[PDB]
Amino acid sequence: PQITLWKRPLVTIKIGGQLKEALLDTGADDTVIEEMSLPGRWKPKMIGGIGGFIKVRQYDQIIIEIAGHKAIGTVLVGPTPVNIIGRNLLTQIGATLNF
């Protein structure tokens, strides 16, 4: 698709067999999702933006579908105010910015 930016670029994702809403976020290096259960071991990450730092759980090699497009990669889980799809996964779906 070609997504204009008059409204938030919200899409449906699927992770752990469940559908969620998430923001396609070119300003995010990494993908950050609200609290949920994921398989396997996690590693720590302390991450920053406006307002300061959150601690998250890093899960690698997670199957996730974004707007119908299949990706497998790193998902950070923690107290984010919104689910954000960052560049690590936007690159897997072939996304570019264009003007």
Place this chain on the structure above:
Amino acid sequence: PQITLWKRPLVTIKIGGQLKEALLDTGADDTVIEEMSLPGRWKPKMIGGIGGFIKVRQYDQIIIEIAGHKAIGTVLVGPTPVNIIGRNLLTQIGATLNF
């Protein structure tokens, strides 16, 4: 242009007679710039992101040049760790996300 997302989508802006580096940020509703003087009236605003809220000054009807494209809109000024061009100005330069 077409901007890939392997790296942060940083561009040069001109604002308030100053050149700055800023992130093209589809996950930002508004444009938020580090501390600087701008002319005219402002009002305070609280904005939230990953780490909680910061206080900013809201300036309306500010001209900006973003990677050579002129726009006008609201600019929020305050203690952001990165200058971010949000959707309010990305729309005006015709930016889309494509995949």
